[PDB]
Design a protein around this nucleic acid. Structure first.
Ligand SMILES: [Zn+2]
Lengths: 221, 83, 71, 25, 101, 129, 132, 217
RNA sequence: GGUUCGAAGACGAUCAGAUACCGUCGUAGUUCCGACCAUAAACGAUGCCGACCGGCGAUGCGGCGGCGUUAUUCCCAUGACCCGCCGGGCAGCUUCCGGGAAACCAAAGUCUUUGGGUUCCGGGGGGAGUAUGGUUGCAAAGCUGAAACUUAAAGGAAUUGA
């Protein structure tokens, strides 16, 4: 039950030197630990099982009906994730889906709709993510509208926090394996977009490994 | 990214490279903040301060990273202009 | 269409009009021979006279013999 | 049965139809 | 789908080549479609050269060679068992097998 | 055939922005293209440019900056009224916070926001954001 | 087909790496050492393990073994991996000067001081070997 | 690579480096290596600009000093030519070298016990160590590669044009890099050159070792 | 004019059952002149024009420059080399340019960030390119072209059991 810090950033988490989880996103460091997110955000981190997909690979000894669990993760106002893990038994499938969902978490981009007051609620600009035959055109919406879409991406946007968005589907959206990757890429490419507001250069700082590189090599092996 | 009051409503700001004048994505694992240690002109030893740079994944997958760092150091004033 | 013309209104209008004939769903409802073969001819309900009853077999595995009425 | 044989059988059948029309006219 | 990158022949932008009749069968094969072979061989097999070198009138008589340009089609080449189906990564290699002996 | 030269120029600078070039060289010296460059100079999306003028269509060297996503061409050029301008900017511009629709008038070439105050329409030129 | 098995190979390297000191080239020496340190159920397995240990000792006496991590060879590698030299190469007063770098070093802070000497340009004809 | 007025060079080591063979390039040419060409030489020889290699070496040494901890420096070697050279370089620096046998699972996977994280990596050859070029994209690790005119430039961070065929040309560049890193860190004073014959630091063929042992004994 | 080859057809076996595989023959065709029609996998299963977007070795044309060469050796420059540069034409290798369901393409990229100009054509599958309408032709056949009726399917890519 007690977590052991495998990575070098895990020792910094165990020593409480890095205070912000967005400093990991700033340096774009690869997260390969599952318990750090549960340590900081324990009660807010919620799980929702979307769909179990059985697939049958055919061998000479009949077939092996293995399951593919889709588990969405995250608080309703904050970070969300999408974990995909296929296994032959349901306990290992759900456990691997929860672990890969804790590893893969993304922030969503809230924006304003014309007038600037209060907290942002809608999608700031027209972005999309396409793969397979799924194209969800993210169009902004006024306040108090809702998500005019299918109920599963409506639930994903309720988990995201963007309460106001108009969608526009295109093609065969019944393929869930391409649909989940499309709705993951569409919310992943929100921050990766050149905007006229982002003209001032981002100030830099020392790497967190370089800042405490004298202490981490001496506090353990 | 202001609000009705005036405070920046965003909680983190992404990076932008100065060589290709392009922003850096969130999950860009090839992005490196390359540091250069400052060297005294009369002693030739370590001083204590550093000079930072930015490397994004697009320049690395295109194949111009060693030229982009060379041009950034040339613009900052380390590498000579002619080369 | 494919041509991004300026004075090309009536050409693409005639193309859309011929596409309206080439469409299958719009053409079938507006046939004269199909409306002649239709026993209603625009009617919703219709009366009739029963004269005999004929049994009809069903299809593959889910089988039955159901008695229809010749009207 | 191929498409070429179907075309040949329909060619013979249309020849028979032309013969019947020539005997009718 | 299209299996090969080309159409199984060396026809690039011409359209028609000279038809060459096959050696084993009488199949009318195109030139670039045909599998061509060029085999050189002495007329002696195991001991005919030794028998001629023992019993002859002339001294150190040179032997002729065989020069026959063979042609095979897709069926006849596999019936003579020359070409062989390879892996899909090895199909793209237009190189001949290595000439070592 | 090269009928709309401005469309090929916008496509060339669009591929230049997709690759990440620092400067671009174009062949004609069209006054509409020069005025469009001076319109973009006031917004500050690109850097300052120069021309090499021969006794033909002189060449233009534009030092581009990474402050532009896509500048598509409008072909053919339709008229824009005051009442229909909302329907133009609804499907043409992505967002309400950022977006510019350049259009020429009888007075001069100006953006969409100044034409709303002056209350005078004109034919559309393009869009850039 | 007297091939030493994986149950012998997983055991013998760990035994030598732990008790590298108490070993010997003789068979009867380490045959009784393996009886002390290890619990082997059968005489045939004991003799196979002891023969493979003597074969690994012959490999050690011949040269270095890639698989096992000997502490003595690790110390010998650590000596030549942490042997810091006294004075290394570069900063003599007289090293090479290149004429095309002479032009580009003139701009920034590598100016033409008194301690410079341009050399003659190197001879060369053509930079392509014939393709055959 | 800039803001120094201390190190200065005059004439003499042309006669040493022509016998060493660091000016020698490859046969073919990569299009990204066109700016590093100084001149040509007969029968398929490029002349690598050694004093531009000096500037790239100074930039790489600034990167080595900016990686302040000397323990977490990965010196990756592939062939038998650059084994004793990177061993003596690890002796001069105080880091952990990798002389061949890269194991997929030490840095990428989290099962094996050897789970380290050195920041700075030094690549001997890209076509040989194409597999350590993969983890530079997954993990944020700077890369100092040694490249030829025949070697391409893909998934690299900084490159140094050197000859990676001759043992003299490899051991010479390591033996010159080891002085620059130690003088830019600073332990030992800037006073004396080296007296001992340089045969110790180059990689030696076993037939040459047996021949020298027979000539000595 | 008809040498050779060789539809129809004969003979010999073949086959439980061969005017099928195969051989010996063999008519029309096979070759041209003066004509008729428009059919091929006329396939690259890929509409035309103009531009931007990596590199490499080489072939075929024209032009241009130069260490060392052969021929006329003996001045003179072109044939034959080698080293280069450009344009048009045909390919190949590598590739996180770019995209797709993949094969893969410097084009099949320059599409959701959707508008460069630009003619023709398809709307679940069959009937069916069938009737019927005329047009061209000595004949064969080509053109535009339905409907009643049936059909929850008919398909493309790419993997297993044998
Ligand atoms: Zn054949």
């Amino acid at each position: 039950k007690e977590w052991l810090p495998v990575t070098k950033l895990g020792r910094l988490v165990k020593d409480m030197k890095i205070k912000s989880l967005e400093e990991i996103y700033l340096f774009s460091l690869p997260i390969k630990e599952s318990e750090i997110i549960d340590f900081f955000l324990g009660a807010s981190l919620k799980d929702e099982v979307l769909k179990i997909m059985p697939v049958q690979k055919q061998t000479r000894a009949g077939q092996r009906t293995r399951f593919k669990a889709f588990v969405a993760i995250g608080d309703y106002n904050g970070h969300v994730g999408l974990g995909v893990k296929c296994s032959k038994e349901v306990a290992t499938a759900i456990r691997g889906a929860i672990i890969l969902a804790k590893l893969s978490i993304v922030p969503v981009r809230r924006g304003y709709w014309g007038n600037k007051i209060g907290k942002p609620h809608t999608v700031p600009c027209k972005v999309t993510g396409r793969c397979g035959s799924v194209l969800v055109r993210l169009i902004p919406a006024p306040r108090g509208t809702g998500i005019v879409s299918a109920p599963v991406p409506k639930k994903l946007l309720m988990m995201a926090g963007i309460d106001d968005c108009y969608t526009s589907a295109r093609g065969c959206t019944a393929t869930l394996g391409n649909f989940a990757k499309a709705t993951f890429d569409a919310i992943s490419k929100t921050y990766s977009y050149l905007t006229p507001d982002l003209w001032k250069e981002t100030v830099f700082t020392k790497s967190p490994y370089q800042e405490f590189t004298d202490h981490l090599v001496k506090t353990h092996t | 990214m202001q609000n009705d009051a005036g405070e920046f409503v965003d909680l983190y700001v992404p990076r932008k490279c100065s060589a290709s004048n392009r922003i850096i994505g969130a999950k860009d694992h090839a992005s490196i903040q390359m540091n250069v240690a400052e060297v005294d002109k009369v002693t030739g030893r370590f001083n204590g301060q550093f000079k930072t740079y930015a490397i994004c994944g697009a320049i690395r997958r295109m194949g111009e990273s060693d030229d982009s760092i060379l041009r950034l150091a040339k613009a900052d004033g380390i590498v000579s202009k002619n080369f | 269409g494919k041509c991004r013309g300026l004075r090309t209104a009536r050409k693409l209008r005639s193309h859309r009009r011929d596409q309206k004939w080439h469409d299958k769903q719009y053409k079938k409802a507006h046939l004269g021979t199909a409306l002649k073969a239709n026993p209603f001819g625009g009617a919703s309900h219709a009366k009739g006279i029963v004269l005999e009853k004929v049994g009809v077999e069903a299809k593959q595995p889910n089988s039955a013999i159901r008695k229809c009425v010749r009207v | 049965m191929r498409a070429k044989w179907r075309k040949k059988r329909m060619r013979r059948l249309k020849r028979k139809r032309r013969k019947m029309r020539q005997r009718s006219k | 789908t299209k299996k090969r990158r080309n159409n199984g022949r060396a026809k690039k932008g011409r359209g028609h080549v000279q038809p060459i009749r096959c050696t084993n069968c009488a199949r009318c094969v195109p030139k670039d479609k045909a599998i061509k072979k060029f085999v050189i061989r002495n007329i002696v097999e195991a001991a005919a050269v030794r028998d001629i070198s023992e019993a002859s009138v002339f001294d150190a008589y040179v032997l002729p060679k065989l020069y026959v340009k063979l042609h095979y089609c897709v069926s006849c080449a596999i019936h003579s068992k020359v070409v062989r189906n390879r892996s899909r990564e090895a199909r793209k290699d237009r190189t001949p097998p290595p000439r070592f002996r | 055939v090269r009928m709309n030269v401005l469309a090929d120029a916008l496509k060339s600078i669009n591929n230049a922005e997709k690759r990440g070039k620092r400067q671009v060289l174009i062949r004609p010296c069209s006054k509409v293209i020069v005025r469009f460059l001076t319109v973009m100079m006031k917004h500050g999306y690109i850097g300052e440019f120069e021309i090499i003028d021969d006794h033909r269509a002189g060449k233009i060297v534009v030092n581009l900056t990474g402050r532009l996503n896509k500048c598509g061409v409008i072909s053919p050029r339709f008229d824009v009224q005051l009442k229909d301008l909302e329907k133009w900017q609804n499907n043409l511009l992505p967002s309400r916070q950022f977006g510019f629709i350049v259009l020429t008038t009888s007075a001069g070439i100006m953006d969409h926001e100044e034409a709303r105050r002056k209350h005078t329409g004109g034919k559309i030129l393009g869009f850039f954001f | 087909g007297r091939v030493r098995t994986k149950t012998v190979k997983k055991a013998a390297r760990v035994i030598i790496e732990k008790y590298y000191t108490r070993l010997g080239n003789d068979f009867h020496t380490n045959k009784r050492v393996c009886e002390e340190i290890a619990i082997i159920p059968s005489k045939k397995l004991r003799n196979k393990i002891a023969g493979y240990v003597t074969h690994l000792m012959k490999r050690i006496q011949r040269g270095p073994v890639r698989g096992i991590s000997i502490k003595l060879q690790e110390e010998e590698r650590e000596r030549r991996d942490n042997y810091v030299p006294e004075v290394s190469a570069l900063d003599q007063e007289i090293i090479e000067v290149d004429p095309d770098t002479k032009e580009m070093l003139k701009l920034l802070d590598f100016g033409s001081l008194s301690n410079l000497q341009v050399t003659q340009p190197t001879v060369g004809m053509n930079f392509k070997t014939p393709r055959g | 690579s800039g803001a120094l007025d201390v190190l200065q060079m005059k004439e003499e080591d042309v006669l040493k480096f022509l016998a060493a063979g660091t000016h020698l390039g490859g046969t073919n040419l990569d299009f990204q290596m066109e700016q590093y060409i100084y001149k040509r030489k007969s029968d398929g020889i490029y002349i690598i600009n050694l004093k531009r290699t000096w500037e790239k070496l100074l930039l790489a040494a600034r990167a080595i000093v900016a990686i302040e901890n000397p323990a977490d420096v990965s010196v990756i070697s592939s062939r038998n030519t650059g084994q004793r050279a990177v061993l003596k370089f690890a002796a001069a620096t105080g880091a952990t070298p990798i002389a061949g046998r890269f194991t997929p699972g030490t840095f990428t996977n989290q099962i094996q016990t050897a789970f380290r994280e050195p920041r700075l990596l030094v690549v001997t050859d890209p076509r040989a160590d194409h597999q350590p070029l993969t983890e530079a994209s997954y993990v944020n690790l700077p890369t100092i590669a040694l490249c030829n005119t025949d070697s391409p430039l893909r998934y690299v961070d900084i490159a140094i044009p050197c000859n990676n065929k001759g043992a003299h040309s490899v051991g010479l560049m390591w033996w010159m890099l080891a002085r620059e890193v130690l003088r830019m860190r600073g332990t030992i004073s800037r006073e004396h050159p080296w007296e001992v014959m340089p045969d110790l630091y180059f990689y030696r063929d076993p037939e040459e070792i047996e021949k020298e042992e027979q000539a000595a004994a």
